[PDB]
Design an enzyme around this catalytic site. Structure first.
Site, PDB file in Angstrom:
ATOM      1  N   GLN A 144      32.395  38.948  39.193  1.00  0.00           N
ATOM      2  CA  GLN A 144      33.831  39.302  39.334  1.00  0.00           C
ATOM      3  C   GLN A 144      34.047  39.999  40.681  1.00  0.00           C
ATOM      4  O   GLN A 144      35.104  39.752  41.324  1.00  0.00           O
ATOM      5  CB  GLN A 144      34.315  40.204  38.201  1.00  0.00           C
ATOM      6  CG  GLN A 144      35.809  40.060  37.971  1.00  0.00           C
ATOM      7  CD  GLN A 144      36.331  40.962  36.894  1.00  0.00           C
ATOM      8  OE1 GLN A 144      35.643  41.852  36.426  1.00  0.00           O
ATOM      9  NE2 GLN A 144      37.575  40.747  36.514  1.00  0.00           N
ATOM     10  N   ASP A 185      33.729  37.486  43.566  1.00  0.00           N
ATOM     11  CA  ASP A 185      34.978  36.689  43.464  1.00  0.00           C
ATOM     12  C   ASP A 185      36.118  37.465  44.139  1.00  0.00           C
ATOM     13  O   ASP A 185      36.861  36.830  44.905  1.00  0.00           O
ATOM     14  CB  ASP A 185      35.339  36.378  42.015  1.00  0.00           C
ATOM     15  CG  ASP A 185      36.620  35.580  41.860  1.00  0.00           C
ATOM     16  OD1 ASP A 185      37.683  36.147  42.139  1.00  0.00           O
ATOM     17  OD2 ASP A 185      36.543  34.385  41.460  1.00  0.00           O
ATOM     18  N   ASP A 224      35.963  39.979  46.303  1.00  0.00           N
ATOM     19  CA  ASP A 224      35.706  40.068  47.759  1.00  0.00           C
ATOM     20  C   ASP A 224      36.283  38.828  48.454  1.00  0.00           C
ATOM     21  O   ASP A 224      36.779  38.981  49.576  1.00  0.00           O
ATOM     22  CB  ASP A 224      34.219  40.229  48.075  1.00  0.00           C
ATOM     23  CG  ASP A 224      33.945  40.706  49.497  1.00  0.00           C
ATOM     24  OD1 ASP A 224      34.422  40.065  50.446  1.00  0.00           O
ATOM     25  OD2 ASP A 224      33.252  41.719  49.643  1.00  0.00           O
ATOM     26  N   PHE A 266      35.257  36.229  54.201  1.00  0.00           N
ATOM     27  CA  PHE A 266      33.906  36.738  54.539  1.00  0.00           C
ATOM     28  C   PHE A 266      33.470  37.732  53.470  1.00  0.00           C
ATOM     29  O   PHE A 266      34.348  38.372  52.890  1.00  0.00           O
ATOM     30  CB  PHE A 266      33.899  37.399  55.917  1.00  0.00           C
ATOM     31  CG  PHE A 266      34.405  36.482  56.993  1.00  0.00           C
ATOM     32  CD1 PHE A 266      33.757  35.287  57.255  1.00  0.00           C
ATOM     33  CD2 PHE A 266      35.562  36.779  57.694  1.00  0.00           C
ATOM     34  CE1 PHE A 266      34.238  34.423  58.227  1.00  0.00           C
ATOM     35  CE2 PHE A 266      36.039  35.912  58.660  1.00  0.00           C
ATOM     36  CZ  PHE A 266      35.376  34.736  58.927  1.00  0.00           C
ATOM     37  N   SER A 311      35.812  43.721  51.524  1.00  0.00           N
ATOM     38  CA  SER A 311      37.284  43.841  51.645  1.00  0.00           C
ATOM     39  C   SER A 311      37.846  44.471  50.366  1.00  0.00           C
ATOM     40  O   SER A 311      38.899  45.115  50.431  1.00  0.00           O
ATOM     41  CB  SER A 311      37.905  42.515  51.946  1.00  0.00           C
ATOM     42  OG  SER A 311      37.521  41.543  50.981  1.00  0.00           O
ATOM     43  N   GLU A 335      41.649  45.857  36.248  1.00  0.00           N
ATOM     44  CA  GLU A 335      41.881  44.801  35.230  1.00  0.00           C
ATOM     45  C   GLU A 335      41.005  45.051  33.991  1.00  0.00           C
ATOM     46  O   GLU A 335      41.501  44.861  32.871  1.00  0.00           O
ATOM     47  CB  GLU A 335      41.647  43.413  35.812  1.00  0.00           C
ATOM     48  CG  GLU A 335      41.786  42.310  34.780  1.00  0.00           C
ATOM     49  CD  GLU A 335      40.494  41.808  34.166  1.00  0.00           C
ATOM     50  OE1 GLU A 335      39.422  42.141  34.669  1.00  0.00           O
ATOM     51  OE2 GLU A 335      40.573  41.065  33.194  1.00  0.00           O
ATOM     52  N   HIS A 373      34.341  33.415  33.352  1.00  0.00           N
ATOM     53  CA  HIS A 373      35.171  33.651  32.142  1.00  0.00           C
ATOM     54  C   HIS A 373      34.368  33.362  30.860  1.00  0.00           C
ATOM     55  O   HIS A 373      34.636  34.010  29.854  1.00  0.00           O
ATOM     56  CB  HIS A 373      36.487  32.867  32.272  1.00  0.00           C
ATOM     57  CG  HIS A 373      37.340  33.379  33.388  1.00  0.00           C
ATOM     58  ND1 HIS A 373      38.442  32.681  33.890  1.00  0.00           N
ATOM     59  CD2 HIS A 373      37.286  34.533  34.080  1.00  0.00           C
ATOM     60  CE1 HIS A 373      38.998  33.379  34.850  1.00  0.00           C
ATOM     61  NE2 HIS A 373      38.294  34.506  35.013  1.00  0.00           N
TER      62      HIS A 373
HETATM   63  C1  HEM Z   1      36.655  40.879  31.565  1.00  0.00           C
HETATM   64  C2  HEM Z   1      36.495  40.102  32.647  1.00  0.00           C
HETATM   65  C3  HEM Z   1      37.566  39.327  33.357  1.00  0.00           C
HETATM   66  C4  HEM Z   1      38.930  39.302  33.210  1.00  0.00           C
HETATM   67  C5  HEM Z   1      39.696  40.183  32.261  1.00  0.00           C
HETATM   68  C6  HEM Z   1      39.444  38.313  34.121  1.00  0.00           C
HETATM   69  C7  HEM Z   1      40.811  38.035  34.304  1.00  0.00           C
HETATM   70  C8  HEM Z   1      41.328  37.190  35.290  1.00  0.00           C
HETATM   71  C9  HEM Z   1      42.715  36.883  35.513  1.00  0.00           C
HETATM   72  C10 HEM Z   1      43.918  37.417  34.773  1.00  0.00           C
HETATM   73  C11 HEM Z   1      42.811  36.010  36.533  1.00  0.00           C
HETATM   74  C12 HEM Z   1      44.105  35.455  37.106  1.00  0.00           C
HETATM   75  C13 HEM Z   1      44.294  34.087  36.540  1.00  0.00           C
HETATM   76  C14 HEM Z   1      45.467  33.323  37.098  1.00  0.00           C
HETATM   77  O1  HEM Z   1      46.561  33.925  37.201  1.00  0.00           O
HETATM   78  O2  HEM Z   1      45.378  32.072  37.380  1.00  0.00           O
HETATM   79  C15 HEM Z   1      41.481  35.749  36.933  1.00  0.00           C
HETATM   80  C16 HEM Z   1      41.191  34.936  37.977  1.00  0.00           C
HETATM   81  C17 HEM Z   1      39.890  34.774  38.399  1.00  0.00           C
HETATM   82  N1  HEM Z   1      38.749  35.199  37.853  1.00  0.00           N
HETATM   83 FE1  HEM Z   1      38.568  36.238  36.255  1.00  0.00          FE
HETATM   84  N2  HEM Z   1      38.420  37.726  34.776  1.00  0.00           N
HETATM   85  C18 HEM Z   1      37.271  38.281  34.372  1.00  0.00           C
HETATM   86  C19 HEM Z   1      35.983  38.019  34.791  1.00  0.00           C
HETATM   87  C20 HEM Z   1      35.654  37.226  35.856  1.00  0.00           C
HETATM   88  C21 HEM Z   1      34.351  36.963  36.288  1.00  0.00           C
HETATM   89  C22 HEM Z   1      33.104  37.541  35.676  1.00  0.00           C
HETATM   90  C23 HEM Z   1      34.469  36.089  37.364  1.00  0.00           C
HETATM   91  C24 HEM Z   1      33.416  35.446  38.188  1.00  0.00           C
HETATM   92  C25 HEM Z   1      32.107  35.495  37.976  1.00  0.00           C
HETATM   93  C26 HEM Z   1      35.862  35.827  37.538  1.00  0.00           C
HETATM   94  C27 HEM Z   1      36.401  35.032  38.515  1.00  0.00           C
HETATM   95  C28 HEM Z   1      37.774  34.814  38.676  1.00  0.00           C
HETATM   96  C29 HEM Z   1      38.330  34.092  39.813  1.00  0.00           C
HETATM   97  C30 HEM Z   1      37.661  33.415  40.995  1.00  0.00           C
HETATM   98  C31 HEM Z   1      39.643  34.065  39.627  1.00  0.00           C
HETATM   99  C32 HEM Z   1      40.672  33.467  40.580  1.00  0.00           C
HETATM  100  C33 HEM Z   1      40.967  34.570  41.622  1.00  0.00           C
HETATM  101  C34 HEM Z   1      41.851  34.014  42.725  1.00  0.00           C
HETATM  102  O3  HEM Z   1      41.327  33.468  43.755  1.00  0.00           O
HETATM  103  O4  HEM Z   1      43.115  34.093  42.604  1.00  0.00           O
HETATM  104  N3  HEM Z   1      36.541  36.522  36.605  1.00  0.00           N
HETATM  105  N4  HEM Z   1      40.577  36.459  36.176  1.00  0.00           N
HETATM  106 CA   LIG Z   2      36.272  39.385  51.823  1.00  0.00          CA
END
Ligand code: HEM
Ligand SMILES: [Ca+2]
Ligand SMILES: *[C@@H]1O[C@H](CO)[C@@H](O)[C@H](O)[C@H]1NC(C)=O
Ligand SMILES: *[C@@H]1O[C@H](CO)[C@@H](O)[C@H](O)[C@H]1NC(C)=O
Ligand SMILES: *[C@@H]1O[C@H](CO)[C@@H](O)[C@H](O)[C@H]1NC(C)=O
Ligand SMILES: *[C@@H]1O[C@H](CO)[C@@H](O)[C@H](O)[C@H]1NC(C)=O
Length: 595
Positions: free
Chosen positions: A105, A108, A110, A186, A190, A258, A351
């Site tokens: 997370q 991600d 960063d 990068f 950040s 979050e 997720h």
């Molecule tokens: C309890 C843990 C977590 C919660 C509650 C959570 C929640 C969220 C939420 C609400 C979004 C926005 C979704 C959208 O509006 O389309 C999101 C996006 C994302 N999550 Fe998770 N997440 C969790 C764990 C993780 C983990 C462990 C990773 C990666 C290993 C991850 C990677 C991402 C990524 C890449 C995005 C898109 C971010 C972007 O570029 O906008 N998340 N997450």
């Molecule tokens: Ca960065």
């Protein structure tokens, strides 16, 4: 014709060109193309966007416009028939700590963030979207299928607002709609320091010249620093408990609160800067605040790089690691270091690694208090449980001794995220991250599963039995075909995540290819990479190769028993050794010689 042109909302920045420090914006990293990998520019397109109308409408917008001759399934139906499961027995990853999920997370956050359009402030449009479930403009609500239990309890839809897009953020017709990356591409910390000057300065302690980051003045962790509160309203961390009234935390990334374990990880990273800034002063009392900050910042950004590329990516990618991320061969200025739109979906394999509960553990790694273990959903935007209930130390023990969820074709996403997600403006623990992910794929114009298989030089199944052979699962392939009708139409988030995992890793081949490329590009395309000759002194770099997540915990908490390898499953006290054993960061090579 060459559209190097468009990009109106950006304050074009001059470059110092011989500065020893990254910018906050990530500007000036690449010399020939200085905007490359800077925040608040378009996500890169590895493949042309795919939209209903070739331009901007997400597939499924018009209830009549097929994709390759078939209707796209409702995101919430895909969620319910495929992603959901009841039984949290047998779901845990026997060889990954909960820190494996958490680091994911962090990295991600960063690398990427495509925020919702801010068109709706001082409007009822967000209300009219949520309140009345009326599809229009940037309102693209997630509609319930018939037989959905949430129909009976919440309304006809879950609300959803389309991601921001470059040039105009309102008007019509562009080559294709391109969504923004609001952080730096990068691996530069950040998320600790910010991706804008505006926030980067507010983050800093500009009362004193020790190069320190601001800290909380309301509350302390046994003398150890907390992140400053965010005194903006409404605060969702206040909303989830109006009696405790403990606001969300303020960090380099807006998302830091979050969930309580991400807030925790953010707390480890801030201390490490402060701890560095005061050590640099000790050795170099002649240094000013700026020099201290930038020099601490630079160490920490190196730390994240090493932990990520040495410890994390090999146990994600496994057998595919060497094939996509061959060992480092110096800075290449012809590499695009920009985060691709598809990466921001590929990385959401995270997720399915989130388990249904979080524990607090005492110094004997035993249950801390009578509610030591809690449901994930009560910890969305929950800062009070840190302030009012043990500081970070009991939660950092749970990251070491508890387990990540394992991806499972029968058990993808825990109901804590799939049914009980809280989002800042909406009132209920009643949302679906899976459904969101799928609607977002569409919103971003994502190509389908076979486009991406094709891109990665992998077979492209067209029938059930092709899909069964690739998924190695007859029932999952069947449910997918029942929903999507052709594998060509499968949303990449779930298509990629359906694939059995590669040997010694936690993603399938398609994901390993998409993740592999991106991580190779941000390492190779980064002028300020830690191993890039001339960034650090050859002695500083022998000092740096000894960093561990073990050591960061030791230096920045009051925990004395750590695993050697914090990402593998570790059990106490068997796999837990004393802190005096681990290895330190020797900062001697940063000694300032005046002559
Ligand atoms: C309890 C843990 C977590 C919660 C509650 C959570 C929640 C969220 C939420 C609400 C979004 C926005 C979704 C959208 O509006 O389309 C999101 C996006 C994302 N999550 Fe998770 N997440 C969790 C764990 C993780 C983990 C462990 C990773 C990666 C290993 C991850 C990677 C991402 C990524 C890449 C995005 C898109 C971010 C972007 O570029 O906008 N998340 N997450
Ligand atoms: Ca960065
Ligand atoms: C800045 O640093 C000084 C000295 O370390 C400290 O007492 C003060 O509280 C800090 N200020 C802020 C705003 O964090
Ligand atoms: C609210 O936080 C307070 C601590 O001030 C706690 O005692 C209470 O049980 C919490 N209630 C809920 C619903 O979270
Ligand atoms: C556990 O995970 C580590 C990290 O990939 C690996 O090297 C080790 O062989 C694994 N052990 C077992 C027993 O699965
Ligand atoms: C730099 O990368 C390009 C494509 O990204 C590749 O063709 C070339 O081999 C690389 N050049 C150097 C100097 O490493």
């Amino acid at each position: 014709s060459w559209e190097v042109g468009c990009g109106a909302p950006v304050p074009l920045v001059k470059c110092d060109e011989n500065s020893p420090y990254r910018t906050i914006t990530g500007d000036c990293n690449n010399r020939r193309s200085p905007a490359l990998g800077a925040a608040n520019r378009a996500l890169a397109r590895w493949l042309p966007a795919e939209y209903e109308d070739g331009l901007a409408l997400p597939f499924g917008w018009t209830q009549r416009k097929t994709r390759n001759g078939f209707r796209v399934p409702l995101a919430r139906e895909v969620s319910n028939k495929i992603v959901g499961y009841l039984d949290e027995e047998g779901v845990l990853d026997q060889n990954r700590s909960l820190l494996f999920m958490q680091w994911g997370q962090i990295v991600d956050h960063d690398l990427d963030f495509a925020p919702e359009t801010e068109l709706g402030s001082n409007e009822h449009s967000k209300t009219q979207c949520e309140e009345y479930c009326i599809q229009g403009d940037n309102c693209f609500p997630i509609m319930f299928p018939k037989n959905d239990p949430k129909l009976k309890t919440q309304g006809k839809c879950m609300p959803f607002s389309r991601a921001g897009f470059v040039c105009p953020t309102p008007p019509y017709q562009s080559l294709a709609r391109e969504q923004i990356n609001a952080v730096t591409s990068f691996l530069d910390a950040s998320l600790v320091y910010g991706s804008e000057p505006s926030l980067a300065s507010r983050l800093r302690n500009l009362s004193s010249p020790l190069g320190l980051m601001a800290v909380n003045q309301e509350a302390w962790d046994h003398g150890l620093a907390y992140l400053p509160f965010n005194n903006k309203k409404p605060s969702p961390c206040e909303f989830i408990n109006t009696t405790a009234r403990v606001p969300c935390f303020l960090a380099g990334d807006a998302r830091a609160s979050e969930q309580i374990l991400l807030a925790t990880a953010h707390t480890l990273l801030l201390r490490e800067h402060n701890r560095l800034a005061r050590e640099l002063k000790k050795l170099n009392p002649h240094w000013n605040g700026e020099k201290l900050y930038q020099e601490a910042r630079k160490i920490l950004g190196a730390f994240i790089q090493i932990i990520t590329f040495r410890d994390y990516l090999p146990i994600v990618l496994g057998s595919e690691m060497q094939k996509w991320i061959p060992p480092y061969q110096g800075y290449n200025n012809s590499v695009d270091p920009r985060i691709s739109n598809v990466f921001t979906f590929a990385f959401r394999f995270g997720h399915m690694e989130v388990p249904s509960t979080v524990s607090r553990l005492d110094e004997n790694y035993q249950p801390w208090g009578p509610e030591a273990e809690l449901p994930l959903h009560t910890l969305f935007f929950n800062t009070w449980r840190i302030i009012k209930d043990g500081g970070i130390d009991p939660l950092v023990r749970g990251l070491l001794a508890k387990k990540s969820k394992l991806m499972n074709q029968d058990k993808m996403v825990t109901s804590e995220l799939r049914n009980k997600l809280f989002q800042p403006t909406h009132k209920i623990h009643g949302f679906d991250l899976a459904a969101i992910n799928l609607q977002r794929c569409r919103d971003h114009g994502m190509p389908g599963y076979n486009s991406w298989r094709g891109f990665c030089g992998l077979s492209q199944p067209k029938t059930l039995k092709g899909l069964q052979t690739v998924l190695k699962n007859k029932i999952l392939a069947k449910k997918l075909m029942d929903l999507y009708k052709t594998p060509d139409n499968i949303d990449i988030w779930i298509g990629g995540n359906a694939e059995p995992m590669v040997e010694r890793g936690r993603v399938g081949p398609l994901l390993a290819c998409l993740l592999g490329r991106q991580f190779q590009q941000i390492r190779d395309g980064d002028r300020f990479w830690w191993e890039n000759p001339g960034v650090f002194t050859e002695k500083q770099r022998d000092s740096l190769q000894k960093v561990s997540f073990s050591r960061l915990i030791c230096d920045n908490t009051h925990i004395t028993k750590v695993p050697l390898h914090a990402f593998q499953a570790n059990n106490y006290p068997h796999d837990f050794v004393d802190c005096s054993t681990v290895d330190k960061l020797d900062l001697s090579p940063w000694a300032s010689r005046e002559n």
